[PDB]
Ligand binder design. Structure first.
Ligand SMILES: CC(=O)N[C@H]1[C@@H](OP(=O)(O)OP(=O)(O)OC[C@H]2O[C@@H](n3ccc(=O)[nH]c3=O)[C@H](O)[C@@H]2O)O[C@H](CO)[C@@H](O)[C@@H]1O
Ligand SMILES: CC(=O)N[C@H]1[C@@H](OP(=O)(O)OP(=O)(O)OC[C@H]2O[C@@H](n3ccc(=O)[nH]c3=O)[C@H](O)[C@@H]2O)O[C@H](CO)[C@@H](O)[C@@H]1O
Ligand SMILES: [Mn+2]
Ligand SMILES: [Mn+2]
Lengths: 808, 808
């Protein structure tokens, strides 16, 4: 018992030595007499020293404290606590006014002084509002924009004419507008509106987490397009006339760069923007202290110089949003605020890094002006430098896919005047067919939270460009059609690895599938509500039948691929149907061995792909995806060689040659007709080596991630705490419910798809022979490719004929 | 062009009327003359009105503002900004001193006055520390505990003897100790230490999100156990002697209730705690304003009354933690702080809701005192009210599982003196074998973040009780063994649904599997480091061989179950091996039909289970899990009936009857030997109907979730913003890396397990017959069950013999 007593004695000796430890008993109900308390308070003199120290310390303010007080004032005004907001605003204004004297930098001194004066005036206005002498709804500090000289200006530059105010001053203003519809009601204006200019074309360049090189290339290409438009010959049949003429075209084009979040912008991108006079950190930090702005917009008529050539000036508005949001939110801000204020004629949308050729804008504007029935158009999407880096299989496969998709599908859809725009493409509309209901349908997701809509609507709007296209075509009391321009070439930079391709295709496939389902369900609105010609309605009905058949065939693609490969190759080897060899006798331990190996490999690969895709992100699993892709590619190459041998050994019956043409040679026929044939010759092998990887891997990973979507008393204090707890718990419960619904939806869809494919494959393998199934598949494929070839030929005839027959 | 001009004119007319909109140009480099600025400032008189309004408003302080200022002061002191902390503390102290006068409630007035005086004294001490007259390391406000009378006290109560201070006053103190090891260094003490009492037994009741009923039942059962210990007859061979005698036992027991988070405690639980005098919201809110405490502890010697019986007083310490953490954190606080201070002899751990019988503590203490080689013990775990609600299959299955596991496995492991404790059980240790290294191994997860350790260590410590048990057994330079007490019955409340059972078993299975792997790898430490008897080392080696074989068999359990069912039932039906019927001829379209149906159903069920488990949480998917479980249960019941028919039709050879006994009848033999036989008769059918559901569903869901684990200038402001951005980005990157590693680990483990099972099943089906595989399985199962039966019989002999042979 010695150690216990020793440790207790040690604790007791450590007890001695607001001291370290005080034990007190508070008696309730006595409430104390107000005689000893006063003397006890007056009996302590260290309070005088503490007060002296605090008073001495609090004499000199600082910039950081002033900014923090202004931030707290902004929060308090957001919570509608006007007394505290007024007090904190007064404190911050006085602090900044005092601080501005000490700063050595003249720019900082001027900015601080101006901000202090603005804050004091706002305090006066808020005091007047509190008094009730001035009555207003939801007061806010007055809008104030600051123009400052650009830090770096090029002495040697050539231009048509530039006022010094426009040339050297960059303007800035932070905005609070929570609903971008009310942008022009709150008093915000742009430099173009102030100066009297009325641009007719607007371009939006969405940006998020990008290097300087992509933005620089995009701006250089846009400047080249403007230069080409300027040098357009006058008084010519092909030339454009009107606002887009020469020597004044640069005044009719405005470029909006809408960043997605100040916390995610690449620092080098910010440095490059500051170089061209479109960003300044000190101005943003000082002038946005008290406003609590949603986004800050800079304005400048930038001049760019490349080597010895001076590009034309570009009117640019850079809107940087404080918090991260979706790209649809950037389009919300752009469309609503800037289109409603400026009221343009055409509205073009592109991403960052899209490098246009010198004639893209000319062709788009020419189509829009000549046709006058076009409510929307989309240009051709291409891969930058396809011939270079030809050793990479992914790049060549993507190049072949882009070319074939553009030619066949875009031409066929554009013949009927209804286009499903590829995501990431460079598109354009006119701000007369998207004025009302189409934009409401576009932004319904932002207007209403996902909980009310559900998972189907969120997945549908994951790619909402097709929604806008359909709303344009099927608009009530209007007949707007779409068009595809072959000469508006825009070159992007596709991913060089399988994993980035997997993620990109995941987003693409989810959006496309659910947009297609929405279009199929709502196709009736074209007849019920729109007012087209009868011929147009009949053509739409024909295209609807074709669309139904094509989608139904596409849904059962993995099963058909497996059945075709299995039947042809492996039951030609096992049952001696390969025409260039006789496998009749053999060991008989090899005839079944090939089929067993093929079935086991296919099933194990599919199981592994499903397990990986439903689980970990496709970034750690690079090796496994590469291995599965390599196995499938080798299998497909072997199948292609065997099929070629079988075809060449056949005596080439008329039916065989006709089916071969209408099945495979449609690609080469269309490519030769449109003149883009060498790309097909170069990339056909690379695409063939990746067909099964495309189908299986991309569809499985896309379907496995359908849920991935974006002066009170004490009792007053107690009630406030309880209310906060209740709100927190209800918010957590709502989030859990949303997650539950999305997960259930994605699981149901994946199970339906996978089990439908498995049941189809089993019931065809067990109950059907190769002689009773392959002719049906050949007929189906030949029909689809014949329709696509007819559409492509029709588009070529239209593009080479309508110019002559424009009179009729 | 009329609408455009009209809208521009509308905007211009809306322009007119800190006003609504001001456009200014700030010239940089001028810096202004200090002549006009002073006159301009003095030219505005509304500032006088604003100052008067602010001065008038700021006269009267409030409770909420004082508490907010104290919170800000606590944050500033946490950031080591002593000037601002001192200023805010002074402001809060003065505000509370002024506020205390106005309050009508005497208790609130007294608490506010005392807190204000304490805050002022702390301000004086901090000012002295800033001056440097007093030099100290990391200053903090002095520890101050408040004792207040209990709101509700029972006038009619019977007890041995209670001082009025102990009977009527409840004590409270908030603690700041960040590392619980330094609890006694900072000056914190408990009431037992102050009063001079030295308890010898401590009990910890971990609580999180529980209703009042469970806590009330646990406290009533503990009081009953204390009453039984008190009434123990003196001067008897069986009776305990020493500190645990009668009439003073209640002074030697302390109960620690460690809540997990103030934001998650059920409000009714807080109300019940306040009823028995263990919680008060006003005291917590007032006295914890400035300290910024990590957890707040209340102390009381509670008296409980049930109906007409008055239970014995219980010394209770309720420690409520501010933020949520793991249960291991609660054990960290309990063990380190309270054990290191009190220095007890025994330390018992239980959950909340565990209802003990009247003799559990007596049996545990008797074993600990008599054996003296026991470093740890665990009691029997049972299901409350098993016979009632017998219609529910899940409850009966769990009852059978608990009984069989306890008897067979616990007896076999306890014979060798090494036990793997069931999670959630009621266990005990002595605070002499866990003093040093075992607790360090226990808390290594809390000491080091998971990023350094990895996923294996986190999954291992998900159930870290087995780690503590192994460290106790294999402690260096000591020979501590464990023991299992059959008579320490603790009854829990098992879940009534399949989904809660699924989640609970997920946690159990992950912890058990990885703890078993750790034990297998580190078994060598018993021979290399520990100092046991040679006989003990040989017994440990034998048990190690048995453990290896048992774990290896358990890993391949689903494949063996599938093979046994398929072979016996379905290749007895197809190949005419069912002895009670002749299926030789038949349609021949049915002989293969049964096998095809069985294979397809099994494969589809497994695929659906994997897809669901890897995806959505098992709460929305109740119907699918129920359907799969029902299908598997019907299949298992049919297989059981067919097997019984086959066995009874056989002429009962000697080998057959011996294998049948040593395979199945071991359960009934052991149950009859230990006297718990009727439960087996009642629940055998219910457990048989859920064997396959257990195996497949629980193992798959457990393996699919291995990743689920818990005065500067402007340039100074710019640098601070940049530093904050860098820290935020690095934190996000680190979190992403951790998620990547955990997901990769879980995917690799799941793939290994599933593919090993599939390959084993395929290579046994294709290359082995029923006559060359079933005898091996029978031999393996018979060997395992024979070893388990021998262990159970040995434990029974020891428990009924060692009492006589205690002399030798
Ligand atoms: C979905 C996906 O994996 N896309 C990848 C794809 O870009 P990918 O071309 O597929 O698509 P993006 O998502 O990058 O394009 C959407 C457009 O909106 C912008 N945007 C993007 C995200 C956002 O939250 N808000 C926003 O406004 C983008 O900058 C772009 O202008 O290849 C890039 C490399 O070549 C990768 O870096 C991208 O991760
Ligand atoms: C993991 C799981 O799904 N367990 C469920 C199981 O309890 P189950 O008995 O399986 O296990 P618990 O996780 O509830 O038990 C852990 C012990 O520590 C406490 N604890 C719990 C969580 C925590 O974050 N910190 C903490 O300290 C618990 O109160 C308990 O005393 O059946 C209960 C209903 O009968 C459910 O409500 C639980 O959700
Ligand atoms: Mn891009
Ligand atoms: Mn529980």
């Amino acid at each position: 018992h010695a150690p216990r007593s020793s440790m207790m004695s040690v604790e007791y000796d450590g007890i001695p030595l607001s001291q370290q430890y005080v034990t007190s008993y508070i008696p309730t109900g006595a409430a104390f007499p107000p005689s000893s308390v006063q003397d006890m308070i007056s009996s302590m003199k260290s309070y005088a020293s503490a007060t002296d120290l605090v008073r001495t310390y609090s004499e000199i303010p600082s910039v950081e404290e002033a900014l923090s007080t202004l931030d707290r004032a902004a929060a308090a005004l957001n919570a509608r606590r006007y007394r505290d907001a007024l007090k904190l605003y007064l404190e911050g204004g006085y602090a900044m006014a005092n601080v501005a004297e000490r700063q050595a930098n003249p720019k900082i001194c001027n900015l601080l002084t101006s901000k202090g004066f603005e804050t004091l005036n706002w305090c006066a206005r808020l005091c007047d509002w509190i008094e009730g002498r001035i009555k207003e709804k939801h007061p806010r500090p007055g809008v104030h924009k600051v123009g400052i000289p650009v830090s770096n200006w090029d002495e040697d530059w050539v231009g048509p004419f530039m006022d010094e105010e426009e040339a050297r001053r960059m303007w800035y203003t932070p905005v609070y507008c929570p609903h971008p519809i009310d942008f022009s009601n709150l008093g915000y204006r742009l430099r173009c509106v102030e100066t009297g200019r009325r641009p007719r074309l607007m371009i939006c360049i969405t940006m998020y987490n990008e290097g300087p090189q992509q933005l620089k290339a995009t701006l250089k290409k846009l400047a080249n397009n403007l230069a080409y438009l300027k040098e357009q010959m006058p008084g010519d049949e092909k030339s454009l006339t009107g606002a887009f003429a020469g020597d004044d075209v640069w005044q009719n084009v405005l470029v909006c760069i809408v960043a997605d979040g100040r916390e995610q912008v690449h620092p080098k991108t910010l440095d490059y923007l500051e170089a061209i006079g479109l960003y300044d950190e000190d101005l943003l930090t000082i002038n946005s202290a008290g406003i609590g702005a949603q986004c800050h917009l800079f304005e400048h008529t930038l001049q760019l110089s490349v080597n010895g050539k001076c590009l034309l000036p570009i009117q640019t508005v850079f809107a940087l949003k404080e918090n991260k949001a979706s790209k649809l939110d950037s389009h919300h801000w752009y469309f609503n605020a800037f289109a409603e204020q400026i009221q343009p004629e055409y509205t073009a949308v592109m991403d960052v890094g899209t490098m246009l050729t010198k004639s893209a804008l000319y062709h788009l504007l020419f189509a829009f002006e000549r046709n006058h029935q076009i409510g929307g158009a989309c240009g051709q999407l291409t891969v930058d430098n396809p011939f270079e880096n030809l050793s990479n299989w992914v790049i060549s496969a993507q190049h072949f896919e882009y070319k074939i998709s553009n030619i066949l599908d875009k031409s066929l859809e554009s013949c009927f005047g209804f286009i499903s725009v590829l995501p990431g493409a460079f598109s354009a509309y006119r701000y007369e067919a998207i004025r009302g209901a189409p934009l409401d349908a576009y932004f319904q997701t932002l207007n209403i939270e996902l909980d009310v809509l559900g998972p189907f609507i969120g997945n549908m709007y994951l790619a909402a460009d097709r929604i806008l296209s359909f709303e344009v075509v099927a608009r009530k009391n209007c007949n707007w059609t779409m068009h595809y321009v072959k000469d508006a070439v825009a070159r992007t930079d596709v991913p060089h690895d399988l994993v980035g391709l997997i993620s990109q295709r995941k987003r693409w496939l989810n959006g496309a599938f659910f947009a297609t389902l929405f279009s199929i369900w709502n196709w009736g609105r074209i007849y019920s509500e729109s007012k087209h010609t009868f011929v147009r309605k009949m053509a739409f009905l024909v295209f609807y039948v074709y669309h139904l058949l094509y989608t139904a065939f596409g849904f059962f693609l993995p099963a058909n691929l497996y059945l075709a490969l299995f039947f042809i190759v492996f039951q030609g080897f096992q049952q001696n149907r390969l025409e260039f060899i006789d496998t009749s006798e053999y060991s008989q331990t090899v005839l079944d061995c090939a089929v067993y190996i093929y079935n086991f490999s296919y099933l194990f690969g599919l199981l592994m792909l499903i397990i990986i895709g439903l689980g970990n992100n496709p970034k750690h699993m690079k090796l496994t995806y590469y291995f599965v892709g390599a196995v499938f590619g080798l299998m497909m190459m072997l199948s292609s060689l065997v099929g070629a041998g079988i075809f060449f050994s056949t005596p080439a019956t008329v039916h065989s040659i006709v089916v071969s043409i209408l099945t495979v040679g449609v690609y080469f026929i269309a490519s030769a007709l449109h003149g883009e044939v060498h790309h097909i010759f170069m990339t056909f092998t690379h695409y063939t080596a990746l067909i099964p990887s495309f189908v299986n891997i991309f569809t499985i990973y896309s379907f496995c991630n359908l849920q991935d979507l974006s002066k009170g008393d004490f009792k007053d204090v107690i009630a406030k705490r309880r209310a906060l707890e209740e709100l927190r718990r209800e918010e957590k419960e709502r989030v859990e419910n949303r997650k539950k619904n999305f997960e259930a939806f994605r699981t149901n869809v994946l199970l339906t798809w996978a089990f439908s494919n498995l049941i189809f494959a089993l019931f065809v393998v067990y109950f059907a022979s190769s002689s009773t199934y392959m002719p049906v598949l050949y007929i189906f494929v030949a029909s689809l490719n014949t329709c696509r070839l007819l559409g492509s030929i029709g588009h070529w005839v239209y593009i080479h004929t309508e110019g002559l027959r424009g009179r009729v």
